[PDB]
Amino acid sequence: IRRFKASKFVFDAFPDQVAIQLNDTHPALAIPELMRIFVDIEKLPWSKAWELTQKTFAYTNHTVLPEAL
Amino acid sequence: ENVAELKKSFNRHLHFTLVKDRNVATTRDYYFALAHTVRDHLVGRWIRTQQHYYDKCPKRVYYLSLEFYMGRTLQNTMINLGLQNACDEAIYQLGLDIEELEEIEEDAGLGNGGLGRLAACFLDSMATLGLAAYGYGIRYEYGIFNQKIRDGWQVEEADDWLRYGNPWEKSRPEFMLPVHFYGKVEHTNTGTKWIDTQVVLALPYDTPVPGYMNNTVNTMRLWSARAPNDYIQAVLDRNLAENISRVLYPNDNFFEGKELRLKQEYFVVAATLQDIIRRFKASKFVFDAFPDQVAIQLNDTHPALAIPELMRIFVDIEKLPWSKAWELTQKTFAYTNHTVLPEALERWPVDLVEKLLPRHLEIIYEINQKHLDRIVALFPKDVDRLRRMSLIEEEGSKRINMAHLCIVGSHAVNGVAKIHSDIVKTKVFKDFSELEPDKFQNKTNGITPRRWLLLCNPGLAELIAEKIGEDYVKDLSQLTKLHSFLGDDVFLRELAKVKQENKLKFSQFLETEYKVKINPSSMFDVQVKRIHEYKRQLLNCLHVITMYNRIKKDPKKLFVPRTVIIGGKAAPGYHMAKMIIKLITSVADVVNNDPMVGSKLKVIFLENYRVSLAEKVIPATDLSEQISTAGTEASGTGNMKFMLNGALTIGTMDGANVEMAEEAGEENLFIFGMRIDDVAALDKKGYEAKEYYEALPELKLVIDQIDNGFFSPKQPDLFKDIINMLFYHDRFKVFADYEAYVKCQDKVSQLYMNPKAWNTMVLKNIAASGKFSSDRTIKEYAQNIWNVEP
Amino acid sequence: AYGYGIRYEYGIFNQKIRDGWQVEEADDWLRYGNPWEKSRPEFMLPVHFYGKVEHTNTGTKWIDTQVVLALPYDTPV
Amino acid sequence: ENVAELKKSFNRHLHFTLVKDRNVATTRDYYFALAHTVRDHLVGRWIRTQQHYYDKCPKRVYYLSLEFYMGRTLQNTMINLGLQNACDEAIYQLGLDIEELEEIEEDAGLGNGGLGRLAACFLDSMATLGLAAYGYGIRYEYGIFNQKIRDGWQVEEADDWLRYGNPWEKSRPEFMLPVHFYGKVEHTNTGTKWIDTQVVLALPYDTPVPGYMNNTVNTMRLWSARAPNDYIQAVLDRNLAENISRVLYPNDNFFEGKELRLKQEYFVVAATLQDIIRRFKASKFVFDAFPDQVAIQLNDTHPALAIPELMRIFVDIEKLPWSKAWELTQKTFAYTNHTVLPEALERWPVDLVEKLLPRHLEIIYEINQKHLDRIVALFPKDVDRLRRMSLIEEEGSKRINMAHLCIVGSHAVNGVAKIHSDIVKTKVFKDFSELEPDKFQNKTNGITPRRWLLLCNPGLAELIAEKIGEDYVKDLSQLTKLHSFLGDDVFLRELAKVKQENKLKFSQFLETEYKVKINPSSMFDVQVKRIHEYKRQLLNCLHVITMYNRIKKDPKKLFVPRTVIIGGKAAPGYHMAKMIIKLITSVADVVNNDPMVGSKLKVIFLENYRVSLAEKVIPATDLSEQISTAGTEASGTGNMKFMLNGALTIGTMDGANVEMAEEAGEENLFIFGMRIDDVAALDKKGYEAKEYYEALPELKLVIDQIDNGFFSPKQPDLFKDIINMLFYHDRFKVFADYEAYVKCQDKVSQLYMNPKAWNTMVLKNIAASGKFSSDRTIKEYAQNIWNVEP
Ligand SMILES: O=C(N[C@@H](Cc1ccccc1)C(=O)N1CC(C(=O)O)C1)c1cc2cc(Cl)ccc2[nH]1
Ligand SMILES: Cc1cc2nc3c(=O)[nH]c(=O)nc-3n(C[C@H](O)[C@H](O)[C@H](O)CO)c2cc1C
Ligand SMILES: Cc1cc2nc3c(=O)[nH]c(=O)nc-3n(C[C@H](O)[C@H](O)[C@H](O)CO)c2cc1C
Ligand SMILES: *Cc1c(COP(=O)(O)O)cnc(C)c1O
Ligand SMILES: *Cc1c(COP(=O)(O)O)cnc(C)c1O
Ligand SMILES: CC(=O)N[C@@H]1O[C@H](CO)[C@@H](O)[C@H](O)[C@H]1O
Ligand SMILES: CC(=O)N[C@@H]1O[C@H](CO)[C@@H](O)[C@H](O)[C@H]1O
């Protein structure tokens, strides 16, 4: 976020500048954290923040084994 | 109130309220549609807030002022209500630009400067603190004139701000009241009667004042004059009564004893007091507890008439005995002193008051007798003391010293800054403070962090919130947490980037608005405030010329580039202020079009300086000029806005400037020139400007260029009047601080060449601005004068 | 592109075979120093944990949290 | 190594080492770039110096201490290497400020006070004298805590000095060693075996110690604890072993028998001795000549375990017979005693030692038996003598008297000042000194002229060099040449100007760091050292209050203005020290904000007193407070720093203070209060503080104000604990020296009114400071204890 705000590119073009790949679910918390930042800190309305969030993240699934879930 | 419903409401208003569709709607229609959409969100809380005050009956505060410099309302309301981001999105989705719509709104310029803006800032803080407070003024049809520059000179254009309609005001027809004028006093056996008077009705218009994120919505009530009830001429003559609220007197720190002004003062006072009395009698609360329920702050002496009006009501109407009425009166009123400059002092000729307000003149006389009787009793031999403490001045023509009336009719009197309150208490009113030492106080001025940080500088507010949370909005003292980042280079560069973007945004403004090309990386040197000899933009002008010559001298010399901006309105009758403006536009013309200086130095006279425009330039400023002669600026508030927004200050030890150094460390401000004591010593010893012009080679050159036509070739002696005043009548000693000033300025540029140290000092300023919130100012007023609580 | 992870003081354990069985030994890979990483002190950040949620009129606040700093170390790719 | 190549190296490091360019580099990057640039200049000589010791094999000296209070290293290194002026120029040319870069460096605060600073000063002198000496300690991850003042109280913040990296330390992985703990003793037929122990590795980190202008670079080796080699928990539990070198115990003159502290002591001792033995066996030198090649100085009893550890190694590992090993041991070790205060004495419970170091407990017992057997043989009838001379104390719980172990295992024992060494020899250890009179010695402490004159006060060093040459740097006794200028008015005014500039520079410090405005021409009254009841900043606080009342009494009285500064850290558990700090910040708050005193008297509590901060305030000081109760301060070294830097001393006849009067003439110091004998007489006779409070009217007032809340209105009994101790438990007799103290203080101000006489006395102090160089101290240690030569 800090690097975005210093890019000279207020987050409308965030996902046109940022792509975040979730390697397995381990960093899944990144989704509600981005929202937390967008909403609680940056004051964006939920709907707009949620949209940017989805455009930002992509998730990679690495297993169907039950004990890894 | 999310995005989808907001777009829905907007379309609804555009259709039903503006009678338009997207193909025929104008930009003004879009602005109004949004304003109405936002306004609706205020209704519920406004009704509940006023209803709350009725039910729980907390002690109420009434800020009575002839001025309320409110600026624009849309953005402010969206922010205090937490709707800005949703609206911004709604408008964007609809394919519009919210910035463009916002520019459509007229400033509510019902004030001249600091005095009226302080009232505006106070209403915002009182609502954010949740106090049961009301603002009472006049709804001027025309506010402070719009300023134009013609052939380098200021021209005045009527500020017809209501032409297209004000969606933020609400006519309250059921509370109209009659105000009385002229007539004659009749002393009967049933009491004294004020008869054969002419009546002018007062219709109040309520404007909501939303507190910052707290569901509180207070009221600002402004009164408009209306006539009561050859035929044609008789109807046209109705304009005469309505002229009372027609236009704001455009003078800053200047008393103009016009009969119409007297009418305005009584008008607002009479309507206001009647309205307060009526509300008191309906409170479900005997005027015994009146002052336990009512506090009325006199903003300067302008509404001084409120004292004998309250007495008139208590005695003539309510039949209370004089002694009891007088006691309740003093417990009700508190007076705020805003200046020690002689030309601002209100002294109304007893003759004029006798004709217009005969009953009030009798009441003021009675107050004066009871007053002098007390003094004669304690200090018999001291005759001259009675002369000095009287509400009446018999110098040439007899007149009323309004300030003295305010002191005796109030239980508390305050100055607006330590240095000023001290002078008011111990020097100016020594005779009074000696008798009642506990009466005089100080209440250092403040500015609201909402309009002056959150609204005007979203970039800065965000950066700060990112690092220390949002609690600082409601408690600005929180800014001291910014200290932890003093050695944080990334933060300092982030701070510098916010200021950089403000400058770029404002540069776009200056290039489309004005010819000139701006160096976005130059240092923005700014002085924006009302044009005054005492505020000295003239001294500033002497420095600009100095920098000019220097470049012409050594062209290739390493010079930190500057974009110098000076803006402000001069009162219409102030000839010297108008001459100084012309002098500045002349200089700029030469500097901006000289090929040897080019992008090195650019000068701009920012026209039509006003609240909405202050919100633009202030956040873009690097260097804030606060250079009034020591002892002249009672306080200042522009100095605070610049400090809160990341600009370094170059100024004298005057008004609140002194406290800014106290809070931030004198070393972190560019203080210079004479101090209160130094100006005194020079006065006793005698000032002769001619000597500095003699000693200072850079100054002599500046002066010779001005007086010889270098800056007015077609009118070689155009500035003759400026030259004479500076040499033989400069009460503000421009030449005396010129050397220290230029030296101070040189150091500023030296520090500017060091981005890391400049920004480190800025940080120390911002982190130290917490004291200057009007929330803190209001808290002190509330617990030490009004005796009220949230 | 950038890779973002955790600089573990200890990576996957070093495996030993004792009496035919695997035994785990701490992988203290930083003991002698890593010339390939570059501390970036200017970009340290605070991370929050625990605390409690507070719903106010200025927005929701996450308060009374414990803070742990995060110092990033850059490795070139 | 001229300016051009230095700028080149700096840019090279900024690029390759910090991976930056001028647009993205931080201030910390610039500091590191310079540090690396300077560090490179140490490599050649460091390798050659250590290589020289190997080839020519001179007898080596090992200063084993749990503390090394090193301060910052950049400036020191630049100076001892003669690179400061070139670097200063290089950095300036690059557009940077070397002072700012220098401030970035963290102090290496691996010490508490005098004891750890003495070790640091000794390393500098040993290198300047060219001795083959090494410093051996613990590389604490956290040094002495950073002190903060919150609501007037001290707060402790972790001193994470390694967070950003230490460029001055060099990991020496090839010399890692295992240290053993716990386990059990096994007596076999092949010798005794210490088995089933837990192991903690010790990795040594070398720091160079550059001698002053002599190509010698010695080593300071600090050990860091590392673990050897449920899974997750097992890895986390590795923190337990590494906790041994995690943090310095922050107590000054206070024994805290915590098991972790015991581990630290054995840790550093075991690693150190193994390393020394290994180096001995590789020297190309049979342990017969071990002590002719090795000398190990025990800095206080902290590393006392080194004696039975050496024996353990000699006997259990090297298989030497007890008698031979014991002889070599005594010839190897020498012990330095640093205090006679009871709470500083190390007495470890045999129980704790039994579990942690079972084999060492057996060795200590054996030593004690052989010891007592000797005493029983010479003094049969004297039973109690055996009780008094035993290494074991059976008072309540059995514990080891570490001091007694140090005496019997060493061939020399020394005090740190004449008066202290006398007390140690004839009073405290009379039983031992009687048997071996030649064993006890004195070695008066010293300070290094480099860090404490050349570095910290460039202005003074230059003035002196201008008049008497630079030879004084390496032979401070040279300062007596300054006598020739005793009647030289121009020199005396030059001396006064240097002190004046130090004050101004430091005033800038105090005003930006603290609120208060300082009178740069006031007398700087300073007391900076660790907060202790025995050092009495409390007595000082009684005087400040006295001066306060006096001004309040007679406002217009001619009073020499003072800026009183008291600074120091209190150990975390020391409640009275913490109360005294609060008492001082409270008093300051009242004094500094009282309008009647104003610029007359200002009080400052200099927070986070540390080595780098001592270098600032000391050179700016006019009056140095050395007021401990006679007999309490073993020596002191702060007293010497102030004397060398042009301050006059007000103090008691204690520690080294006595020798300062001897050297400079008692008349040229403000000595006062009880002397060693006077405190004794009072003890026998019994002390009753209540009587002085009775007799002294100025004192009674001070006390009543403290105890009544005059300095704590919101907490009227806040200082109740201070009042009780002073009246019923003041082991340091504050009230007893109060009168003589205040009288002495009055005379100081009288002399201050006479600039010519004040400065004449200062000159006599500086010209007489030569004895207090640590170069002289080390020379005496070298020829009378270590038997070594350059
Ligand atoms: O630490 C130095 N060099 C470094 C060199 C280095 C840097 C990065 C990875 C491996 C090696 C060093 O030896 N180490 C860093 C590792 C650690 O932190 O454990 C080990 C160093 C060089 C030097 C030269 C002088 Cl004159 C004085 C002190 C010095 N330290
Ligand atoms: C602080 C100040 C404010 C003034 N304001 C006005 C004004 O508002 N209108 C006007 O005609 N003159 C104004 N004057 C000018 C004043 O009436 C008088 O003409 C000059 O000071 C005499 O030199 C002002 C002067 C001062 C010092
Ligand atoms: C010279 C000296 C040093 C002391 N150091 C400490 C200390 O470091 N920590 C602590 O908790 N108490 C310390 N004390 C206080 C001591 O343990 C004891 O509490 C008091 O002296 C009893 O009044 C010290 C006392 C003295 C006289
Ligand atoms: C704040 C403000 C002022 C007062 O500024 P000073 O510099 O204190 O005189 C005047 N006019 C406007 C439009 C303001 O915003
Ligand atoms: C020298 C020094 C000391 C010892 O000072 P005394 O006044 O002798 O107790 C303690 N702390 C620091 C930081 C020092 O420089
Ligand atoms: C009479 C008058 O307008 N006085 C003005 O009042 C404002 C508000 O207090 C001050 O900040 C300012 O210095 C002063 O010039
Ligand atoms: C146990 C201890 O820390 N003793 C301290 O040692 C130093 C160094 O010798 C002395 O100057 C000082 O007076 C004394 O208090």
Q: What is the DSSP string of D517-567?
A: ---TTSEEEEEES---TTTTHHHHHHHHHHHHHHHHHSTTS----EEEEEE
Pick from D530, D610, D652 the residue to mutate for probing ligand 5's pocket: most ligand atoms within 8 Å of its CB: D530
Give residue ranges with CB within 6 A of ligand 6. Answer: B 114-115, 118, 252-253, 300, 338-339, 344, 416, 445, 633-637, 655
Query: In B485-620, which residue ranges form alpha helices assigned H by DSSP?
Result: 489-513, 537-553, 575-592, 611-617
For chain A, report the end-to-end CA distance as a whole number of angstroms. 29
> Residue D21 annotated as binding?
yes
Q: Give the span between the Cα atoms of B628 and B609, in whole angstroms.
A: 18
Residue pointed to by tokens 């009302």: B530
**Residue of minimum CA distance from atom 10 in ligand 2:** B574
Q: Give the span between the Cα atoms of D680 and D340, in whole angstroms.
A: 15
Backbone angles phi, psi at D124, to 5 degrees: -65, -40
**Contact criterion met (CB below 8 Å) for D595 and D159:** no
CB contact under 8 A, C31 and D165: no
Q: Active site includes D36?
A: no
Active site residue: B263, B535, B582, B764, which one? B535
> Residue B21 annotated as binding?
yes
**Contact criterion met (CB below 8 Å) for B114 and B636:** yes
Best B489, B497, B763 member to test D by mutation, with max D CBs in 10 Å, is: B489
Work out the angle at residue B772's Cα, subtended by the Cα atoms of residues B768 and B778, and round it to the nearest 5 degrees. 145
Q: Are strands A20-23 and A57-60 parallel, antiparallel or unpaired?
A: parallel
* Residue numbers in D near B489 (CB within 8 A): 26-28
Q: Say which residues have a Cβ less than 8 Å from residue B450's Cβ, sequence separation at least 6.
A: B76, B79, B80, B124, B128, B212, B473
Q: Say which residues have a Cβ less than 8 Å from residue D283's Cβ, sequence separation at least 6.
A: D54, D57, D293
Q: Are strands B333-336 and B294-299 parallel, antiparallel or unpaired?
A: parallel
Q: Active site includes B530?
A: yes
Residue pointed to by tokens 């005001």: B169
From the list B349, B315, B367, the residue with the least C-alpha distance to B185 is B315
The residue type of C57 is N
Ligand showing the shortest atom-to-Cα distance for residue D16 = 1
Active site residue: B272, B301, B546, B637, which one? B637
Q: Say which residues have a Cβ less than 8 Å from residue D528's Cβ, sequence separation at least 6.
A: D565, D566, D567, D568, D606, D609, D614, D617, D618, D638
> Residue B22 annotated as binding?
yes
Backbone angles phi, psi at B630, to 5 degrees: -55, 130
Work out the angle at residue B486's Cα, subtended by the Cα atoms of residues B480 and B487, and round it to the nearest 5 degrees. 155
Pick from D117, D302, D338, D418 the residue to mutate for probing ligand 7's pocket: most ligand atoms within 8 Å of its CB: D338
CB contact under 8 A, B665 and D511: yes
Radius of gyration of chain C (CA): 20
From the list B660, B655, B661, the residue with the least C-alpha distance to B631 is B655
SS (H, E, C) B374-413: HHHHHCCCCHHHHHHHCCEECCCCCEEEHHHHHHHHCCEE
Looking from the CA of residue B112, the nearest atom of ligand 6 is 3
Give residue ranges with CB within 6 A of ligand 3. Answer: D 251, 253-254, 341, 343, 532-534, 571, 573-574
Q: Which two tokens stand for residue B649?
A: 């200050």
Q: Which two tokens stand for residue D214?
A: 């002599």
CB contact under 8 A, D19 and C38: yes
Q: What is the dihedral of CA D739, D744, D745, D748, to 10 degrees?
A: 170
Instruction: Tell me the CA–centroid distance for residue D443 and ligand 5, in Å.
Output: 18
Domains and CATH numbers, chain B: 2-446+774-788 (3.40.50.2000), 447-773 (3.40.50.2000)
* Residue numbers in C near B213 (CB within 8 A): 56-58
CB contact under 8 A, D165 and C39: yes
**Residue of minimum CA distance from atom 1 in ligand 4:** B638
Size (chain B), residues:
790
Q: Which two tokens stand for residue B184?
A: 């004659």
Relative orientation angle of helices D537-553 and D575-592, to the nearest 10 degrees: 20
Active site residue: D77, D632, D637, D777, which one? D637
**Contact criterion met (CB below 8 Å) for D113 and D535:** no
- Looking at residue B191, the DSSP 8-state letter turns out to be -
Cross-chain CB nearest to D512 (options B489, B667, B756):
B667
Name subunits touching A (3+ CB pairs < 8 A): B, C
CA distances, D268 to each of A23, A42, D139, D284 (Å): 46, 53, 10, 26
Q: Give the span between the Cα atoms of D644 and D664, in whole angstroms.
A: 12
**Contact criterion met (CB below 8 Å) for B526 and B565:** yes
Report the binding-site residues of A for AMP: 2
Q: Which two tokens stand for residue B318?
A: 């309510």
Backbone angles phi, psi at B442, to 5 degrees: -130, 150
Q: Give the span between the Cα atoms of D300 and B113, in whole angstroms.
A: 73
From the list D140, D108, D115, D130, the residue with the least C-alpha distance to D61 is D130
**Contact criterion met (CB below 8 Å) for D419 and D655:** yes
CB contact under 8 A, B3 and A45: yes
CB contact under 8 A, D231 and C33: no
Angstroms from C58 CA to nearest CA on chain A:
9
Pick from B65, B68, B69, B115 the residue to mutate for probing ligand 6's pocket: most ligand atoms within 8 Å of its CB: B115
DSSP string, B513-538: HSSS---TTSEEEEEES---TTTTHH
Active site residue: D499, D529, D536, D600, which one? D529
Q: Give the span between the Cα atoms of D413 and D405, in whole angstroms.
A: 11
Chain breaks in chain B (C to N over 2.5 A) after: 229, 285
**Contact criterion met (CB below 8 Å) for B335 and B329:** no
In sequence order, what are the beta bridge partners of D461? none
Backbone angles phi, psi at B59, to 5 degrees: -55, 130
Exposed/middle/buried for B692, CB within 10 Å: 0-12, 13-18, 19+? buried
Q: Give the span between the Cα atoms of B722 and B708, in whole angstroms.
A: 12
Residue pointed to by tokens 């500035």: B719
Give residue ranges with CB within 6 A of ligand 7. Answer: D 114-115, 118, 252-253, 300, 338-339, 344, 416, 445, 633-637, 655
Q: Give the span between the Cα atoms of D63 and D67, in whole angstroms.
A: 10
**Residue of minimum CA distance from atom 9 in ligand 7:** D338
Exposed/middle/buried for C58, CB within 10 Å: 0-12, 13-18, 19+? middle
Q: Active site includes D530?
A: yes
From the list B633, B650, B603, B634, the residue with the least C-alpha distance to B752 is B650
Q: Is the CB of B338 under 6 A from ligand 2?
A: no
Q: Give the span between the Cα atoms of D402 and D415, in whole angstroms.
A: 16
- Looking at residue D407, the DSSP 8-state letter turns out to be H
Closest Cα in chain B to D26: B489
CA distances, B169 to each of B577, B695, C45, D294 (Å): 34, 58, 48, 94
CB contact under 8 A, D173 and C32: yes
Q: Is the CB of D529 under 6 A from ligand 5?
A: yes
Work out the angle at residue B56's Cα, subtended by the Cα atoms of residues B55 and B57, and round it to the nearest 5 degrees. 95
Work out the angle at residue D57's Cα, subtended by the Cα atoms of residues D53 and D62, and round it to the nearest 5 degrees. 70
From the list D513, D309, D303, the residue with the least C-alpha distance to D403 is D303
The number of CA neighbours under 13 Å toward the Cβ of D591 is 31
Q: What is the dihedral of CA D394, D395, D399, D405, to 10 degrees?
A: -80
Q: Which two tokens stand for residue B287?
A: 């005027």
From the list D341, D355, D169, the residue with the least C-alpha distance to D259 is D355
Q: How many CB atoms lie within 10 A of CB D700?
A: 13
Residue pointed to by tokens 């005779």: B431
CA distances, D299 to each of D118, D303, D409, D717 (Å): 10, 7, 14, 42
Q: Is the CB of B573 under 6 A from ligand 2?
A: yes
Size (chain C), residues:
77
**Contact criterion met (CB below 8 Å) for B625 and B615:** no
**Which technique was used to obtain these atomic coordinates?**
X-ray
**Contact criterion met (CB below 8 Å) for D547 and D122:** no
| B243 membership: H or E segment, kind and range | none
SS3 (DSSP) at D401: strand
From the list D299, D374, D362, D304, the residue with the least C-alpha distance to D61 is D299
| A62 membership: H or E segment, kind and range | none
* Residue numbers in B near C71 (CB within 8 A): none
CB contact under 8 A, C42 and B213: no
Pick from D254, D569, D732 the residue to mutate for probing ligand 3's pocket: most ligand atoms within 8 Å of its CB: D254
Q: Active site includes D529?
A: yes
Q: Are strands D146-150 and D153-157 parallel, antiparallel or unpaired?
A: antiparallel
Radius of gyration of chain D (CA): 27
Q: Give the span between the Cα atoms of B297 and D141, in whole angstroms.
A: 62
DSSP string, B28-95: HHHHHHHHHHHHHHHHHHHHHHHHHHHHH-PPEEEEE-S-EEEE--HHHHHHHTT-HHHHHHHHHHTT
The residue type of B433 is S
Cross-chain CB nearest to D164 (options C24, C31, C41):
C41
For chain C, report the end-to-end CA distance as a whole number of angstroms. 10
Q: Which two tokens stand for residue B465?
A: 């919130």
* Residue numbers in B near D27 (CB within 8 A): 487, 489, 756
SS3 (DSSP) at D184: strand
Name subunits touching D (3+ CB pairs < 8 A): B, C
Q: Is the CB of D43 under 6 A from ligand 1?
A: yes
Q: Are strands D108-110 and D68-71 parallel, antiparallel or unpaired?
A: antiparallel
Work out the angle at residue D514's Cα, subtended by the Cα atoms of residues D513 and D516, and round it to the nearest 5 degrees. 145
Q: What is the dihedral of CA B133, B138, B139, B145, to 10 degrees?
A: -120
The number of CA neighbours under 13 Å toward the Cβ of B229 is 6
**Contact criterion met (CB below 8 Å) for A52 and B93:** no
Closest Cα in chain D to B483: D513
Q: Are strands B177-181 and B198-210 parallel, antiparallel or unpaired?
A: antiparallel
Instruction: Tell me the CA–centroid distance for residue D713 and ligand 2, in Å.
Output: 51
From the list D23, D26, D24, D29, the residue with the least C-alpha distance to D10 is D29
> Residue B457 annotated as binding?
no
Q: Say which residues have a Cβ less than 8 Å from residue D124's Cβ, sequence separation at least 6.
A: D76, D80, D209, D211, D212, D448, D450, D451, D774
Closest Cα in chain C to D25: C42
